[PDB]
Amino acid sequence: GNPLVYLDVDANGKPLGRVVLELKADVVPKTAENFRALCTGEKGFGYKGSTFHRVIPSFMCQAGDFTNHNGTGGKSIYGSRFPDENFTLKHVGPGVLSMANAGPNTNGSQFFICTIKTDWLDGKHVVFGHVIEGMDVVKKIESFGSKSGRTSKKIVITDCGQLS
C-alpha cells in the first residue's frame, strides 16, 4: 500500500513530537517516491537535520532545503528539479502535504504542510500526501511562525524515516 513516513521535530533542542505522513503513491508515484527516499536518506542525502525555514500562521509550514537552509535550495532524487506530475489531488484543508516550487516544473525537495484550506494553490503545487498523526505537532510549529515567515525558534527535523 501507500508508504507511511515520519518526521521527528525539535524546537530549540526540545522535542515537539512526531508527524506521520501518508504518501499518495497510488496517484503521484514519482513525487511520493522522491519524498520517501529523502526521508530514509537511502541515496546518501535527505531531510534529516534540515529545518522548517518558512512558517506562516493560518497558512502553512515549509521545510526541506537541505543544501542552502534558506528556501533557495534542495534537490530531488532524480536531479536538481523534476516536473509537475499531476494536479489531481487538491489542497482540501489542514494537513495536506504539497510540493514547494519556484514556478512550473521546479520541484526539488522543499515541501509544505497546510494549516488551512489553500485552494488558490490548486493547479500550481503538486499535492502528494497528508498528515495521519501529529497535527498537534504541526500546530506547535505554526505557533512559532510569523507573517514574514521567519520563525521565533529553530525548528529542526532531528530524525525521519519510513514506517511501512
Ligand SMILES: CCOC(=O)CNC(=O)NCc1ccc(N)cc1
Ligand atoms: C506555499 C509554498 O510556497 C512556495 O513554494 C513559495 N516558493 C518558494 O519558497 N520557492 C523557493 C523554492 C526554490 C526551489 C525549489 N525547488 C522550491 C522552492
